[PDB]
Design a protein around this motif. Structure first.
Motif, PDB file in Angstrom:
ATOM      1  N   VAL A 154      40.724 113.483  83.047  1.00 53.74           N
ATOM      2  CA  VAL A 154      41.163 112.154  83.699  1.00 53.74           C
ATOM      3  C   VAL A 154      39.658 111.362  83.750  1.00 53.74           C
ATOM      4  N   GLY A 155      39.753 109.954  83.418  1.00 56.13           N
ATOM      5  CA  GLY A 155      38.774 109.212  83.536  1.00 56.13           C
ATOM      6  C   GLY A 155      38.903 107.958  84.572  1.00 56.13           C
TER       7      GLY A 155
ATOM      8  N   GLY B 155      34.205 114.460  94.519  1.00 57.75           N
ATOM      9  CA  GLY B 155      35.044 113.563  95.176  1.00 57.75           C
ATOM     10  C   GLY B 155      36.562 113.939  95.241  1.00 57.75           C
ATOM     11  N   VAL B 156      37.573 113.335  95.460  1.00 56.66           N
ATOM     12  CA  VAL B 156      38.712 113.266  95.626  1.00 56.66           C
ATOM     13  C   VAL B 156      39.488 112.221  95.060  1.00 56.66           C
ATOM     14  N   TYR B 157      40.553 112.563  94.005  1.00 54.59           N
ATOM     15  CA  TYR B 157      41.236 111.242  93.653  1.00 54.59           C
ATOM     16  C   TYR B 157      42.811 111.546  93.832  1.00 54.59           C
ATOM     17  N   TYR B 158      43.532 110.261  93.867  1.00 53.17           N
ATOM     18  CA  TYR B 158      45.057 110.435  93.886  1.00 53.17           C
ATOM     19  C   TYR B 158      45.628 110.553  92.455  1.00 53.17           C
ATOM     20  N   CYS B 159      46.480 111.367  92.453  1.00 52.95           N
ATOM     21  CA  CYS B 159      47.324 111.614  91.248  1.00 52.95           C
ATOM     22  C   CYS B 159      48.720 111.287  91.349  1.00 52.95           C
ATOM     23  N   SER B 160      49.433 110.117  90.983  1.00 53.57           N
ATOM     24  CA  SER B 160      50.644 109.655  91.299  1.00 53.57           C
ATOM     25  C   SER B 160      51.719 110.720  90.526  1.00 53.57           C
ATOM     26  N   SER B 161      51.475 111.207  89.311  1.00 53.29           N
ATOM     27  CA  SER B 161      52.203 111.853  88.611  1.00 53.29           C
ATOM     28  C   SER B 161      52.430 113.237  89.199  1.00 53.29           C
ATOM     29  N   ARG B 162      51.629 113.570  90.122  1.00 53.85           N
ATOM     30  CA  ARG B 162      51.953 114.854  90.761  1.00 53.85           C
ATOM     31  C   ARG B 162      52.128 114.745  92.464  1.00 53.85           C
ATOM     32  N   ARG B 163      52.021 113.495  93.067  1.00 49.47           N
ATOM     33  CA  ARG B 163      51.874 112.902  94.533  1.00 49.47           C
ATOM     34  C   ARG B 163      51.057 113.891  95.082  1.00 49.47           C
ATOM     35  N   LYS B 164      49.827 113.920  94.499  1.00 48.81           N
ATOM     36  CA  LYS B 164      48.705 114.772  95.360  1.00 48.81           C
ATOM     37  C   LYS B 164      47.380 114.352  95.135  1.00 48.81           C
ATOM     38  N   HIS B 165      46.344 114.705  95.980  1.00 49.19           N
ATOM     39  CA  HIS B 165      45.042 114.223  95.837  1.00 49.19           C
ATOM     40  C   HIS B 165      44.346 115.693  95.684  1.00 49.19           C
ATOM     41  N   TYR B 166      43.328 115.689  94.273  1.00 49.47           N
ATOM     42  CA  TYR B 166      42.864 116.877  94.124  1.00 49.47           C
ATOM     43  C   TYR B 166      41.256 116.651  94.052  1.00 49.47           C
ATOM     44  N   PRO B 167      40.572 117.537  94.586  1.00 47.33           N
ATOM     45  CA  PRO B 167      39.167 117.473  94.629  1.00 47.33           C
ATOM     46  C   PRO B 167      38.725 117.607  93.139  1.00 47.33           C
ATOM     47  N   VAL B 168      37.550 117.102  92.666  1.00 44.15           N
ATOM     48  CA  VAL B 168      36.986 116.974  91.175  1.00 44.15           C
ATOM     49  C   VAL B 168      35.652 116.773  91.296  1.00 44.15           C
ATOM     50  N   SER B 169      35.014 117.484  90.181  1.00 46.18           N
ATOM     51  CA  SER B 169      33.551 117.223  89.602  1.00 46.18           C
ATOM     52  C   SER B 169      33.811 116.235  88.590  1.00 46.18           C
ATOM     53  N   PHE B 170      32.800 114.990  88.491  1.00 43.54           N
ATOM     54  CA  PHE B 170      32.951 114.226  87.390  1.00 43.54           C
ATOM     55  C   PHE B 170      31.590 113.849  87.078  1.00 43.54           C
TER      56      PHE B 170
ATOM     57  N   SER C  44      32.891 101.458  78.740  1.00 41.91           N
ATOM     58  CA  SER C  44      31.548 101.703  79.403  1.00 41.91           C
ATOM     59  C   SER C  44      31.865 101.814  80.818  1.00 41.91           C
ATOM     60  N   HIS C  45      30.809 102.349  81.648  1.00 41.98           N
ATOM     61  CA  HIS C  45      30.902 102.793  82.789  1.00 41.98           C
ATOM     62  C   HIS C  45      32.049 103.974  83.216  1.00 41.98           C
ATOM     63  N   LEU C  46      32.460 104.674  82.342  1.00 41.00           N
ATOM     64  CA  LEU C  46      33.458 105.585  82.538  1.00 41.00           C
ATOM     65  C   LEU C  46      33.144 106.944  82.930  1.00 41.00           C
ATOM     66  N   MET C  47      33.746 107.660  83.939  1.00 38.13           N
ATOM     67  CA  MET C  47      33.131 108.951  84.090  1.00 38.13           C
ATOM     68  C   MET C  47      34.566 109.961  84.143  1.00 38.13           C
ATOM     69  N   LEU C  48      34.344 111.032  83.545  1.00 37.60           N
ATOM     70  CA  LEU C  48      35.192 112.016  83.295  1.00 37.60           C
ATOM     71  C   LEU C  48      35.294 113.204  84.082  1.00 37.60           C
ATOM     72  N   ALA C  49      36.451 113.684  84.300  1.00 42.39           N
ATOM     73  CA  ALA C  49      36.755 114.863  85.131  1.00 42.39           C
ATOM     74  C   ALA C  49      37.775 115.765  84.500  1.00 42.39           C
TER      75      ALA C  49
END
Ligand SMILES: COCc1ccccc1CC(=O)N1CCC[C@H](C(N)=O)C1
Ligand SMILES: [Zn+2]
Length: 140
Positions: free
Chosen positions: A126-127, A55-70, A90-95
């Motif tokens: 990132v979790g 998927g893709v997540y929004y990182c506010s500290s970089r003002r960027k969207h990053y593609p990730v495997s989680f 619980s129900h936490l996913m890391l990348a």
């Protein structure tokens, strides 16, 4: 900071929930760092109902969207902070990705919709708190 707006629900990190959120509480789980409050206006986010691990997540500290495997949603140890003592979340996913305090609330999305929100971070990790099992978010 950040929230998911689905129907008449607002999904936020429980540790960032406001005074107004607790008075308009629908559901909360401290072990998942999630809180859902009711809203007057309808939201436009769609929750994913899938087992995507990319998927893709929004990182506010970089003002960027990053593609990730989680990873799949799991019970993961999370160090003590000003919000919670040392515990199993619980129900936490890391990348492998950048995250800093201030990045919680950023959305993680796949082709099916919203997967979850940033909740934790480490040295190069990132979790995300998963929301895909909360089927009731689609109804009433
Ligand atoms: C978004 O990354 C935050 C971060 C990056 C890098 C280092 C530390 C953090 C903070 C952190 O992980 N926590 C504080 C807030 C509550 C979180 C929880 N869900 O228990 C844990
Ligand atoms: Zn998906």
């Amino acid at each position: 900071s950040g929230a998911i707006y689905v129907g008449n629900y607002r999904v936020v990190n429980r540790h960032l929930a406001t005074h107004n959120d607790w008075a308009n509480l629908v559901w909360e789980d401290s072990s998942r760092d999630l809180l859902v409050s009711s809203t007057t206006a309808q939201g436009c986010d769609t929750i994913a109902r899938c087992d995507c691990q990319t998927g893709v997540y929004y990182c506010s500290s970089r003002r960027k969207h990053y593609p990730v495997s989680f990873s799949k949603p799991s019970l993961i140890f999370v160090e003590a902070s000003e919000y919670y003592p040392a515990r199993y979340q619980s129900h936490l996913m890391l990348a492998v990705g950048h995250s800093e305090p201030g990045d919680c609330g950023g959305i993680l999305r796949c082709q099916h919709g919203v997967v979850g929100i940033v909740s934790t971070g480490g040295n190069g990790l990132v979790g995300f708190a998963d929301v895909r099992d909360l089927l009731w978010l689609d109804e009433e």
